[PDB]
Design a protein around this ligand. Sequence first.
Ligand SMILES: CCCc1cc(=O)[nH]c(N)n1
Length: 379
Amino acid sequence: TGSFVEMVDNLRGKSGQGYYVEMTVGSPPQTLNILVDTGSSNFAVGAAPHPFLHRYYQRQLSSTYRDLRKGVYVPYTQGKWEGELGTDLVSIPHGPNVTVRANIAAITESDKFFINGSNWEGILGLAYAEIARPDDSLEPFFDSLVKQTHVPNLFSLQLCGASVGGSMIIGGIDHSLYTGSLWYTPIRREWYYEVIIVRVEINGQDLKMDCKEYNYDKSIVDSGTTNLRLPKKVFEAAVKSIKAASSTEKFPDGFWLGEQLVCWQAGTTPWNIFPVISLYLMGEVTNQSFRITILPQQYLRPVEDVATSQDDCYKFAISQSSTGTVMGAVIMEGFYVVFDRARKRIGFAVSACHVHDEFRTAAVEGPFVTLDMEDCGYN
Ligand SMILES: CCCc1cc(=O)[nH]c(N)n1
């Protein structure tokens, strides 16, 4: 049929602080909440006390704990930690019914990494080898899982909006998590989950750049990132185009920088004045592409605020980047995304749980005749 009921709704989170899954490590197993991250490729867990950790990995208590007698250091855009390598038996209570020996980094030192009141104490790097620390020699979690178990080389994510929730379906595709068709873009290279963007529209108006601008110096699908991050030039034209489309209301300058909340009486958010955003992505067929479309409900992240109800408050969740395009949680929150590693591709369908209104919905449409798409990549 297509129903993975044990794995539906296995993710949780706070807004702006990421999506996490419940995992266990060791013997006897220790329950820990682990961040689901397609932008990195290292499994790592808090193994010591910290001001923002409620619990941590007590490796001396694990009878199956192995020491790799080695060190590991991982930097991110947000934060960095260093830890002691080693292995232990790992399992996901609301995942596939398996236990696997895998690589673990026990975090001893970390800087601006563990978030206050996040409720997660580690991270699952789901991206490929080519970017693992200390190097490509370290086999990542999902590669271990497929080695030691019969589970298909494939996971899907449904990240829902709004504490948030979602579904990581390991080893398959759940039919209840989308509507309409799955459209596939090729993973251009197995390191990040790198895709190619061939065109951008705001309310159907072409942003009109050379397409290389959209993929400078890469475009990636990153569950571990909150915002839709765009290259400086692309960001500045989108904001200009979005400012124009929303011009019946003016907002403070700081709002467009992510520095300031905008607010409306409850239920009166004027979604319809804000534009739709379309990203055309390279297809499987030659000279073909499809487009995904998100709503202001995806790129205006809601913020609870400290004064009263009676106002619904939001943050602009599109930000500037220097490392390329990052299709983070604001993009992924409109779609069921299928990381089809077995067939070097990434699937997009309309999410069955996405936030929208009566009059507009997130969309995934195709095909479109689009030429010289290979040219859009960086080299
Ligand atoms: C805990 C956050 C880890 C992280 C940080 C970051 O900057 N990017 C990604 N993909 N992941």
